[PDB]
Amino acid sequence: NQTVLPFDGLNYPEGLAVDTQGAVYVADRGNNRVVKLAAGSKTQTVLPFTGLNDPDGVAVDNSGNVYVTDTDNNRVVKLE
Amino acid sequence: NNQTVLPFDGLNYPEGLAVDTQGAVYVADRGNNRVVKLAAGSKTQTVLPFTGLNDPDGVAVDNSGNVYVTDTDNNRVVKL
Amino acid sequence: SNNQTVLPFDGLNYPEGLAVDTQGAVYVADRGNNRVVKLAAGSKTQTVLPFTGLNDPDGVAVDNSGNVYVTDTDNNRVVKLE
């Protein structure tokens, strides 16, 4: 059963992660942002990272912290 | 600290990968527009029955075994 | 709290994939340096994992047993450590 998740206006999405609650996180590379879609939701949320330049990878730990590879700034950023 | 090459076949620019709770490894074989899976101990990958992928980049797997992929060039996230 | 912090990795060069394990250690596919680097939570120490012969690795994953997996993209292969 293939389903398309109701994200909005993605622009070359690259990294993705899924947490224990079924929320899906996407490094929306072409929009320099990380978006999150809760399970069952139709409205995605742009997370409050700042200063990203072509973010590639996203990861989420067991306590809900979100990590992104900010590729063109050669750094890894954590949002708590 | 022993390195092993896993017995995937015919990969073309493999990009994202994920590993589930049972040790199965999922790979976004971007250059072949497919997602392949090698169960722990298996010798032959399976090709997951996604449709219409184009330069898929990221893969993730949730606790219930659902597989999520960033279909980059189609600006969408697909769930199996 | 939405506080943003830059993790104290050293010398990354176009980092791509990342993973976090159950202890909070962060693993990065440091693509431009053909290496995978690990930073334990709160540490000032990064560890270069003993993968060999990588070429532009892009993806990294870590399983519950601590085994580490990397897509060695330009070598068209997936390698496992442990």
CSV table of C-alpha atoms in Angstrom, one decimal:
chain,number,residue,atom,x,y,z
A,1,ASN,CA,0.0,0.0,0.0
A,2,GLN,CA,1.9,3.1,-1.2
A,3,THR,CA,0.6,6.4,0.2
A,4,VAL,CA,1.9,10.0,-0.4
A,5,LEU,CA,2.2,11.9,2.8
A,6,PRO,CA,0.5,15.3,2.9
A,7,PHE,CA,3.5,17.5,3.1
A,8,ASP,CA,3.3,20.9,1.4
A,9,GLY,CA,5.6,22.6,-1.1
A,10,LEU,CA,8.6,20.4,-0.7
A,11,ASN,CA,11.6,21.4,-2.8
A,12,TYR,CA,14.1,18.5,-3.3
A,13,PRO,CA,13.5,16.7,0.1
A,14,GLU,CA,16.5,14.7,1.1
A,15,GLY,CA,17.0,13.4,4.6
A,16,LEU,CA,14.0,12.0,6.6
A,17,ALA,CA,13.5,10.4,10.0
A,18,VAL,CA,10.5,9.0,11.9
A,19,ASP,CA,10.1,9.2,15.6
A,20,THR,CA,8.4,6.8,18.1
A,21,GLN,CA,5.1,8.8,17.7
A,22,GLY,CA,5.0,8.4,14.0
A,23,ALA,CA,6.0,11.9,13.2
A,24,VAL,CA,8.0,12.2,10.0
A,25,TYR,CA,10.8,14.8,9.7
A,26,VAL,CA,12.2,15.9,6.3
A,27,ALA,CA,15.2,17.9,5.4
A,28,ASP,CA,13.6,20.1,2.8
A,29,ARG,CA,16.9,20.9,1.2
A,30,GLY,CA,15.8,23.4,-1.5
A,31,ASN,CA,13.8,25.4,1.0
A,32,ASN,CA,16.6,25.5,3.7
A,33,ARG,CA,14.3,24.1,6.3
A,34,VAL,CA,13.3,21.0,8.3
A,35,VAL,CA,9.6,20.2,8.3
A,36,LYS,CA,7.7,17.8,10.6
A,37,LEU,CA,4.4,16.1,9.9
A,38,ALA,CA,2.7,14.5,12.9
A,39,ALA,CA,1.0,11.1,12.3
A,40,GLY,CA,-2.5,11.7,10.8
A,41,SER,CA,-1.9,15.5,10.3
A,42,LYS,CA,-2.4,17.4,7.1
A,43,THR,CA,-0.4,20.5,8.1
A,44,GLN,CA,3.3,20.2,8.4
A,45,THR,CA,5.3,22.3,10.8
A,46,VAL,CA,8.5,24.2,10.0
A,47,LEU,CA,10.9,23.6,12.8
A,48,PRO,CA,12.7,26.6,14.4
A,49,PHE,CA,16.2,26.0,13.0
A,50,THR,CA,17.9,29.1,11.7
A,51,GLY,CA,20.6,29.8,9.2
A,52,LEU,CA,20.5,26.4,7.4
A,53,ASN,CA,22.2,26.2,4.0
A,54,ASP,CA,21.2,23.1,1.9
A,55,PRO,CA,20.5,20.8,4.9
A,56,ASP,CA,20.8,17.2,4.0
A,57,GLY,CA,20.3,14.8,6.9
A,58,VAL,CA,17.9,14.7,9.7
A,59,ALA,CA,17.8,12.5,12.8
A,60,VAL,CA,15.7,12.4,15.9
A,61,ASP,CA,16.7,10.9,19.3
A,62,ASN,CA,14.6,9.1,21.9
A,63,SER,CA,14.0,12.3,23.9
A,64,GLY,CA,12.7,14.2,20.8
A,65,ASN,CA,15.8,16.3,20.0
A,66,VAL,CA,16.2,16.9,16.3
A,67,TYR,CA,19.6,16.9,14.6
A,68,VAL,CA,20.3,18.2,11.1
A,69,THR,CA,23.4,18.2,8.9
A,70,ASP,CA,23.7,21.8,7.7
A,71,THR,CA,25.8,20.7,4.8
A,72,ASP,CA,26.9,23.9,3.2
A,73,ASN,CA,27.9,25.3,6.6
A,74,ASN,CA,29.9,22.2,7.5
A,75,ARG,CA,28.2,21.8,10.8
A,76,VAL,CA,25.6,19.7,12.7
A,77,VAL,CA,22.8,21.5,14.5
A,78,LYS,CA,20.7,20.2,17.4
A,79,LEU,CA,17.3,21.6,18.3
A,80,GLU,CA,16.2,20.8,21.9
B,1,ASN,CA,35.7,-3.3,14.3
B,2,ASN,CA,35.5,-5.9,11.5
B,3,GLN,CA,34.2,-4.4,8.3
B,4,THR,CA,31.9,-6.5,6.0
B,5,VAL,CA,30.4,-5.5,2.6
B,6,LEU,CA,26.8,-6.4,2.6
B,7,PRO,CA,25.6,-8.5,-0.4
B,8,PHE,CA,23.5,-6.0,-2.2
B,9,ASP,CA,23.5,-6.3,-6.0
B,10,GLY,CA,23.7,-3.8,-8.7
B,11,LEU,CA,23.7,-0.6,-6.6
B,12,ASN,CA,24.1,2.7,-8.5
B,13,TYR,CA,24.9,5.7,-6.2
B,14,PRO,CA,23.3,4.3,-3.0
B,15,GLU,CA,22.4,7.2,-0.8
B,16,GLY,CA,20.1,6.9,2.3
B,17,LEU,CA,20.0,3.8,4.4
B,18,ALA,CA,18.1,2.6,7.4
B,19,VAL,CA,18.3,-0.4,9.7
B,20,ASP,CA,15.2,-1.8,11.5
B,21,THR,CA,14.9,-3.5,14.9
B,22,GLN,CA,15.5,-6.9,13.3
B,23,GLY,CA,18.7,-5.8,11.5
B,24,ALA,CA,17.3,-5.5,8.1
B,25,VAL,CA,19.0,-2.9,6.0
B,26,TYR,CA,17.1,-0.6,3.6
B,27,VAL,CA,18.9,1.4,0.9
B,28,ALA,CA,17.8,4.2,-1.4
B,29,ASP,CA,19.5,3.0,-4.6
B,30,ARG,CA,19.1,6.5,-6.1
B,31,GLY,CA,20.6,5.8,-9.5
B,32,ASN,CA,18.2,2.9,-10.0
B,33,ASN,CA,15.1,4.7,-8.7
B,34,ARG,CA,14.4,2.0,-6.2
B,35,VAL,CA,14.6,1.0,-2.5
B,36,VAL,CA,16.2,-2.3,-1.8
B,37,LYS,CA,16.2,-4.3,1.5
B,38,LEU,CA,18.6,-7.0,2.8
B,39,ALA,CA,17.3,-8.9,5.8
B,40,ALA,CA,19.9,-9.9,8.4
B,41,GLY,CA,21.6,-13.0,7.0
B,42,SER,CA,20.0,-12.9,3.6
B,43,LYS,CA,22.0,-13.2,0.4
B,44,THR,CA,19.6,-11.6,-2.1
B,45,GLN,CA,18.0,-8.2,-1.6
B,46,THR,CA,14.4,-7.6,-2.2
B,47,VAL,CA,13.1,-4.6,-4.1
B,48,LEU,CA,10.4,-2.8,-2.3
B,49,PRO,CA,7.2,-2.3,-4.3
B,50,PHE,CA,7.3,1.5,-4.5
B,51,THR,CA,6.0,3.0,-7.7
B,52,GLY,CA,7.2,6.0,-9.6
B,53,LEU,CA,10.3,6.9,-7.7
B,54,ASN,CA,12.7,9.3,-9.2
B,55,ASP,CA,16.1,9.9,-7.6
B,56,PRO,CA,14.9,8.7,-4.2
B,57,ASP,CA,17.4,9.9,-1.5
B,58,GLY,CA,16.3,9.1,2.0
B,59,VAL,CA,14.8,6.1,3.6
B,60,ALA,CA,13.4,5.5,7.2
B,61,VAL,CA,11.6,2.7,8.9
B,62,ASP,CA,9.3,3.0,11.9
B,63,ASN,CA,8.7,0.6,14.8
B,64,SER,CA,5.8,-1.1,13.0
B,65,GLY,CA,7.9,-1.7,9.9
B,66,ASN,CA,6.4,1.0,7.7
B,67,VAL,CA,9.0,2.3,5.2
B,68,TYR,CA,9.2,6.0,4.2
B,69,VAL,CA,11.2,7.4,1.3
B,70,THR,CA,12.0,10.9,0.1
B,71,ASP,CA,11.2,10.8,-3.7
B,72,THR,CA,13.4,13.9,-4.2
B,73,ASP,CA,12.7,14.7,-7.9
B,74,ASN,CA,9.0,14.3,-7.3
B,75,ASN,CA,9.0,16.6,-4.3
B,76,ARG,CA,7.1,14.1,-2.2
B,77,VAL,CA,7.5,11.6,0.7
B,78,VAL,CA,6.0,8.1,0.1
B,79,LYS,CA,5.0,5.5,2.7
B,80,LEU,CA,4.8,1.8,2.2
C,1,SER,CA,12.8,25.1,24.5
C,2,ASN,CA,13.8,25.4,20.8
C,3,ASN,CA,17.4,26.3,21.7
C,4,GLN,CA,19.7,25.6,18.8
C,5,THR,CA,23.2,24.4,19.4
C,6,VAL,CA,26.0,23.6,17.0
C,7,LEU,CA,27.6,20.2,18.0
C,8,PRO,CA,31.4,20.5,18.5
C,9,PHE,CA,32.5,18.4,15.5
C,10,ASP,CA,35.9,19.3,14.1
C,11,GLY,CA,36.8,19.7,10.4
C,12,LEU,CA,33.7,18.5,8.7
C,13,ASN,CA,33.6,18.9,4.9
C,14,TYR,CA,30.1,18.6,3.3
C,15,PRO,CA,28.6,16.4,6.0
C,16,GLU,CA,25.6,14.5,4.6
C,17,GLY,CA,24.0,11.6,6.5
C,18,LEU,CA,23.6,11.5,10.2
C,19,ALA,CA,22.3,9.1,12.8
C,20,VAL,CA,21.8,9.2,16.6
C,21,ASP,CA,22.0,6.1,18.8
C,22,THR,CA,20.1,5.2,22.0
C,23,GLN,CA,22.9,6.7,24.1
C,24,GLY,CA,22.7,10.0,22.2
C,25,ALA,CA,25.9,9.6,20.2
C,26,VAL,CA,25.7,11.4,16.8
C,27,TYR,CA,27.3,9.8,13.7
C,28,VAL,CA,28.0,11.8,10.6
C,29,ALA,CA,28.9,10.7,7.1
C,30,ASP,CA,31.6,13.4,6.5
C,31,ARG,CA,31.4,12.9,2.8
C,32,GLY,CA,34.2,15.4,1.8
C,33,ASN,CA,36.7,13.6,4.1
C,34,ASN,CA,35.7,10.0,3.2
C,35,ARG,CA,35.1,9.2,6.8
C,36,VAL,CA,32.4,8.6,9.4
C,37,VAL,CA,32.7,10.5,12.7
C,38,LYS,CA,31.0,9.8,16.0
C,39,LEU,CA,30.5,12.3,18.8
C,40,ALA,CA,29.2,11.1,22.2
C,41,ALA,CA,26.6,13.2,23.9
C,42,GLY,CA,28.2,16.2,25.7
C,43,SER,CA,31.6,15.1,24.6
C,44,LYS,CA,34.6,17.1,23.4
C,45,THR,CA,35.9,14.0,21.6
C,46,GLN,CA,35.0,12.9,18.1
C,47,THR,CA,35.9,9.3,17.0
C,48,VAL,CA,36.8,8.4,13.4
C,49,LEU,CA,35.2,5.0,12.9
C,50,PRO,CA,37.6,2.4,11.3
C,51,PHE,CA,35.9,2.1,8.0
C,52,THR,CA,38.4,1.6,5.2
C,53,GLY,CA,38.5,2.7,1.6
C,54,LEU,CA,35.3,4.9,1.6
C,55,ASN,CA,34.6,7.1,-1.4
C,56,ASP,CA,32.2,10.0,-0.8
C,57,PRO,CA,30.0,8.2,1.8
C,58,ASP,CA,26.6,9.7,2.0
C,59,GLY,CA,24.4,7.7,4.5
C,60,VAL,CA,25.0,6.3,8.0
C,61,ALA,CA,22.7,4.2,10.2
C,62,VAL,CA,23.3,2.6,13.6
C,63,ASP,CA,21.3,-0.4,14.9
C,64,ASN,CA,20.2,-1.2,18.5
C,65,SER,CA,23.4,-3.4,19.0
C,66,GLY,CA,25.7,-0.5,18.0
C,67,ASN,CA,26.6,-1.9,14.6
C,68,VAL,CA,27.2,1.0,12.1
C,69,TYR,CA,26.3,0.9,8.5
C,70,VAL,CA,27.4,3.3,5.7
C,71,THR,CA,26.5,3.8,2.1
C,72,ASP,CA,29.9,4.0,0.3
C,73,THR,CA,28.1,5.9,-2.6
C,74,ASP,CA,30.9,6.2,-5.2
C,75,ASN,CA,32.0,2.6,-4.6
C,76,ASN,CA,28.3,1.4,-5.1
C,77,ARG,CA,28.4,-0.6,-1.8
C,78,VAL,CA,27.1,-0.7,1.7
C,79,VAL,CA,29.6,-1.5,4.5
C,80,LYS,CA,28.9,-2.6,8.1
C,81,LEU,CA,31.2,-2.2,11.1
C,82,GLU,CA,30.9,-4.7,13.9
